[PDB]
């Protein structure tokens, strides 16, 4: 009975591997071996944003490309203007152990969470001129590790109990639960059209999830350690992953394979975050040795470096116009490069 | 610069004033991480000193202290739950009178102190219920569980030295910070002082290296 099921699983794995072998007629390097490079890329620090009291753990951009929210471990969220370096809002949290933050695509709400296993949602536009807790969402049994908005009253979260969940804010009850991972889930990424998302967990594995159904579409493997970051290509047909084995990788959905690996023989530190550019030609990554690297995404060549931080680069972000990049690190400063 | 921009700048300066008000207290606090077992006198230890992830803020002569109790949540192996690398000391509770679980307590001790995140953090070790240890050693010899005991199984000094030396061998070769240990009853009065002196010595030890004197 059980042995027959295990034999069937082995046969299915063999069939999947053979099918993935039969579709690789040529590699990506050969196709893109007759085009110009991007040359050398140089960036300068336009602004520096000061005022957090401790390490910085996350940040997120607004959809107007001017406003920012950042979270620190002193128990504060701050909303900044970036053209003038003015502080628009400051928010104190009830729980000082915070791990992530998000900014709604309309500008009305913010969300956060951490080691308290709860997701908190704050309202920014009231009639009494102050910010107050709109809602608290509970039901996870592990620390919250990511959250992303879909609408004003639909959110998605991932937790360290090996589960993801889609919630309806107006009612306060879970709508969908996504299960199947073996280890803690570390990151999420929403598709441009908001009908799929991807997750990466501490089993050296990534999964593609449908939203309206609740089932797993595809599973991607090939890394050899934990996965800390993930993001989509601009057109929503490929994604990139970053591990603590000091490599990044590019995966494709339709081809269902792995295309290119970004690694250098002089890097022995893990990766904390990744991101793309507006055209998808440059890939940016942040490392544990307080540096950032800009790679040519079609050739796997180092095309630039960003240096100027002091302790460790923990988070990155690119605006919806491709006009600035923001980095945040463990020395409590945020920097804007252009 | 127009008028509304000036008003916004003034608002930003007020927010800055509040943050600089809080910075002074933030930069003066001492954090201590509490760890113990299920049956150790943890609750009585907290209660008789008039003091999820629980917290306890209090004060000695002039210093503000904060004790962080994880409450048995340390089942997270290594991923990125080790975000307590800004503490000054780890304070362990052990039940000496219950010989049958000493091996488990030792394993839990060896699983924590040998982690690279806690490289520059000192360890304080409280051994609790010593009177019950005196009552138990007379009847049940400690030699029936460990074969390395050497001396009279009825003498407190030999067994206490055995326990201390058995806890010390598990540490790493690197010696940057010491290991303090106390034989205190369930509820004593010098516990606050005992922690105070052991933290003062650690801070002085680190200052002696910050001044290039060593």
């Amino acid at each position, epitope marked *: 009975e059980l042995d027959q099921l295990r034999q069937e699983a082995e046969q299915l794995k063999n069939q999947i591997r053979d099918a993935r072998k039969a579709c690789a007629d040529a590699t990506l390097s050969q196709i893109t071996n007759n085009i110009d490079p991007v040359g050398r890329i140089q960036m300068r620090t336009r602004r520096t944003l000061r005022g957090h009291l401790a390490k910085i753990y996350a940040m997120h951009w607004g959809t107007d490309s*001017r406003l920012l929210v950042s979270a620190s471990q002193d128990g504060k969220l701050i909303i900044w203007d970036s053209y003038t370096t003015n502080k628009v809002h400051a928010i104190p949290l009830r729980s000082s152990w915070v791990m992530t933050c998000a900014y709604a695509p309309s500008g009305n709400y913010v969300a956060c969470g951490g080691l308290d296993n709860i997701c908190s949602i704050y309202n920014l536009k009231t009639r*009494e*001129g*102050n910010v107050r807790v709109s809602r608290e969402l509970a039901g996870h049994t592990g620390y919250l590790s990511c959250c992303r908005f879909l609408d004003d009253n639909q959110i998605v979260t991932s937790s360290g109990d090996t589960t993801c969940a889609l919630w309806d804010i107006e009612t306060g009850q879970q709508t969908t639960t996504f299960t199947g991972h073996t280890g803690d889930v570390m990151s999420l990424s929403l598709a441009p059209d908001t009908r799929l998302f991807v997750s990466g967990a501490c089993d050296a594995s990534a999964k593609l999830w449908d939203v309206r159904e609740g089932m797993c579409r595809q599973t991607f493997t090939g890394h050899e350690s934990d996965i800390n970051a993930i993001c989509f290509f601009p057109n929503g047909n490929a994604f990139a992953t970053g591990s603590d084995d000091a490599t990044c990788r590019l995966f494709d959905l339709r081809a269902d394979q792995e295309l290119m690996t970004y690694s250098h023989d002089n890097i022995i530190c893990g990766i904390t975050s990744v991101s793309f550019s507006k055209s998808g030609r440059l890939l940016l990554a942040g490392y544990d040795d307080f540096n950032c690297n800009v790679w040519d995404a079609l050739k796997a060549d180092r095309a630039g470096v960003l240096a100027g931080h002091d302790n460790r680069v923990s988070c990155l972000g690119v605006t919806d116009d491709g006009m600035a990049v923001a980095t945040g690190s463990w020395d409590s400063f945020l920097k804007i490069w252009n | 610069v*127009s*008028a509304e*921009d000036k008003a916004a700048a003034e608002r930003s300066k*007020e927010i800055d004033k509040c943050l600089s008000r809080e910075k002074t207290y933030v930069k003066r606090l001492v954090k201590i991480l509490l760890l113990g077992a299920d049956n150790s006198g943890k609750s009585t230890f907290l209660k008789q000193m008039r003091i999820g992830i629980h917290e306890y803020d209090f004060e000695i002569k002039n210093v503000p202290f904060k004790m962080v109790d994880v409450g048995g949540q340390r089942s997270e192996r290594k991923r990125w739950f080790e975000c307590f690398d800004s503490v000054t000391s780890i304070l362990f509770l052990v039940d000496s009178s219950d010989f049958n679980r000493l091996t488990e307590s030792l394993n839990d001790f060896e699983t924590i102190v040998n982690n690279r995140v806690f490289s520059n953090v000192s360890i304080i070790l409280f051994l609790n219920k010593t009177d019950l240890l005196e009552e138990k050693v007379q009847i049940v010899s400690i030699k029936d569980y460990f074969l390395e005991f050497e001396g009279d199984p009825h003498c407190l000094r030999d067994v206490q030295k055995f326990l201390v030396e058995c806890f010390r061998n598990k540490r790493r070769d690197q010696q940057q910070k010491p290991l303090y240990h106390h034989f205190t009853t369930a509820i004593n009065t010098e516990n606050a002082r005992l922690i105070f002196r052991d933290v003062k010595d650690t801070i002085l030890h680190d200052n002696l290296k910050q001044l290039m004197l060593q």
Partner: single-chain antibody
Amino acid sequence: VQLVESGGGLVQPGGSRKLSCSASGFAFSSFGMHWVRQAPEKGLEWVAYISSGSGTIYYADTVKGRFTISRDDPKNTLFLQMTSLRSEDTAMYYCVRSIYYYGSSPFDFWGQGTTLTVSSADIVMTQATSSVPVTPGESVSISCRSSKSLLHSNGNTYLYWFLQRPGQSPQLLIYRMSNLASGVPDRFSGSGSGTAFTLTISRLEAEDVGVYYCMQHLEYPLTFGAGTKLEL
């Protein structure tokens, strides 16, 4: 949200008086406050400004040296002290709340006013008309002109449109020349250029007869228009 004023009455020339205002329902210590004035059978005009934290204080040229403004934040109260009164100070007085940051709406709530009876580089806003009859079901247009460009180098135009119904305090219709306020039906619209502006109303109905005012906010002092009357 509520602002209640007191301290009105009848005085003699050369006297002194103190007006008080009590606030209830919002964070009084995060807003700055304005004192605004209306003469009998005339238009509005601005009197004084005090900011959040008492950092900055502004007066008008006809009240400098005689009037004084203050706030008490624990008690949630605003005070105006007035001395050396004249026959030109007989009027109704309003208290207004204002908050400034990137994207706000600074003149959204007005008080109810008190009555007092006693025994240049400024920008001029014209509003050359005074009245126009109308009938429900059609559309209406109103236009104003200024003596200086209201457009800045940061891409913003500072123009505000207010409405006042018979027997009631004013309210905000439009801020910064194109933004519709909260709770206002979207029949109203605003547009214009650097020195000529228009407000348009589609499908004119009841509860829209009264006086329409326009105001600038480039630089102190703040100056009002003359106001256009709309009757059915």
